[PDB]
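Can you give me the bound-state structure? Components:
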Amino acid sequence: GEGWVLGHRYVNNDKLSKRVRKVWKPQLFQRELYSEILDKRFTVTVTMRTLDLIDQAC
Amino acid sequence: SSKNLGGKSPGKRFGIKKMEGHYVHAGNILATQRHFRWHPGAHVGLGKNKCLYALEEGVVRYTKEVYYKTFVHVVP
RNA sequence: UUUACCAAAAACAUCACCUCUAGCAUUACUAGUAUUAGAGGCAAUGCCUGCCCAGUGACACCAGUUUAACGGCCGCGGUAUUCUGACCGUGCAAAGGUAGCAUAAUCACUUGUUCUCCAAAUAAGGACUUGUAUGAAUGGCCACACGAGGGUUUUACUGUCUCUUACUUCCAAUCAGUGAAAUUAACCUUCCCGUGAAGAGGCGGGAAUAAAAAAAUAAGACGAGAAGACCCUAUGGAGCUUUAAUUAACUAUUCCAAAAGUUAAACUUAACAUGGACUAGCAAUUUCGGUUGGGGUGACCUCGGAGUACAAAAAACCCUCCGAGUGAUUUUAAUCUAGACAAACCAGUCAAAAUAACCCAUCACUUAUUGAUCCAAAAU
RNA sequence: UCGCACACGCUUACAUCAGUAACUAAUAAUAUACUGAUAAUUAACAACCAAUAAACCAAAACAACACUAAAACGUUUAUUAA
RNA sequence: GAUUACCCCUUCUACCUUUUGCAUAAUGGUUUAACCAGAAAAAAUCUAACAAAGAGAACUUUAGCUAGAUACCCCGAAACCAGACGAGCUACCCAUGAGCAGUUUAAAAGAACCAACUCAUCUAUGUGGCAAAAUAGUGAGAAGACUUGUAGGUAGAGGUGAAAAGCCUAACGAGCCUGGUGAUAGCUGGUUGUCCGAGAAAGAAUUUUAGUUCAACCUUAAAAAUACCCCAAAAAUUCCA
RNA sequence: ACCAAAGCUAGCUCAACAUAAAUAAAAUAAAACAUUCACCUAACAUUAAAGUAUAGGA
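Here's the bound-state model for the whole set.
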């Protein structure tokens, strides 16, 4: 629910005026974790905020 | 090209709506006029626009009097 | 060198001059480095390029600097035969055209005046300067050579001309072979004087006339050919330009976040990439009234009164006179029942009478003096 | 008078025989450019082929040379392999 | 119509469209054949079913309800958007080759003239042509910023352009093809058999004048009224015997 | 009687059944135009709710 989200943009956020479609893409950063089951260090470029949920999923 | 300027005014249709001998009703407009061309007589009321009307049911009659007035009467 | 296919020219390019921006790296610039690269103007060369930074732009930061940045560089009065004004006084401005040039690719008046050229010169050349409306890097003034550029005068030679004539060849002409085209409502298709939407072979009245071709002349059939390229109309289209209004994408910023450090018992830092609003330079969508003796310009657009509009209404013109988007003084217009005027729609006037409680009016001649929807607010 | 060869191309037009009322080359003659059938020259001509790694400075203009604009194509050595 | 088994004489200003008005020298048509442009029922009028109910489990209803039958045609842009095709034409550039006699001359791929080649100055001819860019005479460059072959690159919310609003496959103020698309057109050009009755040329408004919305009229089918020409009582008329 | 018409047959339409990546627009309607626009790209059966509740330069 992040990658490739294309919405619409307005000026005063109340529109009697023009509406122009705007593109939105998620932020990408590197997250290094360690899997003991697979015995492998993993690198995830995935969603930042999701990692905050993963930390609560442990 | 024209320096002078003026507008046109729609008519308010001033005049006498009813005639002598006609059978009218109470509250009916008799004569719409500017200022006083004629004066209200018996059983005839006067308006703010100086328009005479009939007070009661009857017949319209015009009568001239000189003491120079013109009265309109309504005879039940 | 340039509008291939109406413009080859003074235009563009060109050596050269000047201003100004770039101290930086591995698929432009450039495998370059201030003597290099990008941008702008001018255009060999020769002599020069004076003044003004108040506004705009630009650079250092709110103040100043900057003209080979965008640009700008005056008027009036008085003074010696005539005339003129070296000089003086004064208003204004940021500062008021210096050298040179000039009826000019510039001069309206204009065919300025004078001189040269010609038997005659609105052109041309050489001067004068009250330069409507030249001017110094959108450079100024000259300049050898150069030019299928733009003008003027003598000589030479010519069918250009006075003034045309003759000849040759290819067509035109004839015959034979092959056999088009646009155009075309149907055509028995004369002329004159009149009329007819005002330019008649078809109408009227007069005149003229047996019926059909070929070689020629281009007046008419408002000939043929292009749904005028001028004008105006359409709530047509498109290109271009902006301080028209309204604002996503790209190039550079201000803050808070992501990511890192610091103290005490709440604060400071940005290498790469990515966000939320935000400030500038760039870009993105459309609009562009009507009336109108064509349009544009000018004027006008709603309302009230007095004429045009002679004894109830109403009645136009870019006809004609005046008035308004209110001004002020005192009492105050509380609830609703008939019934009418005017009226396309919608907006405007009069009002008996009943009830509750008391017991609208004057001026601006009398009337004018405003605004129908949806949406906001002092609060209902 | 101005044309024969090499091409990129152009897909039997061409050569022989036979027949041309008709179409085809604006007609006839006929035919290299019509129909029908049947012939269509090679090669030492032109296309198609070694992998790499080293050596070397001082352009071309019938060029010792010189100039500028700073220089189409060139050779040699060694290894593997057909 | 007469007239003779034919003709002269007399009687008559094509059709259509558009208009205040056209035989009009306003519009469209060579002729013929064929093709070719009024398909929508809510409320209503009308024919039938039943009736305080109709109608095939859905709605209406102080005579309704249900069913059937009656009125609103085509062609045409200039342009916009999307996806692609185009630099064998032409513009520029990259890579690789080739071409440009002769004469005067001091060393001079140096200057000037002049053939090829590259251009198109002037004149004439050609004007459904030889040719949708020509031919003849003449003229420019012709060692240069030159010409040219082959192999490549750059395209339309652009490229290129010694910069003309030029070129990008014979018409570029922004190519062409396909699709959106039967875009939009208040405009203009069009809309076909008979007979009968009646029969319109201007009130105010409108980002409106070449268009619309109700009045001023008109037509169909029914009902209830009355209406006008209108003299003296009275205010050219306004009213009424 | 001349160019000529006139004499048939292939052929199909439709209904039913069987079987190396990334939000498209705009013209247009609101007689201009700018918020807005059934519709179209893929999934979307009948009767009625209902052209109702609402939304819209209301």
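A couple of observations. The domain at 1-76 of chain B is CATH 2.40.50.100 (OB fold (Dihydrolipoamide Acetyltransferase, E2P)). Chain B has no helices and eight strands.
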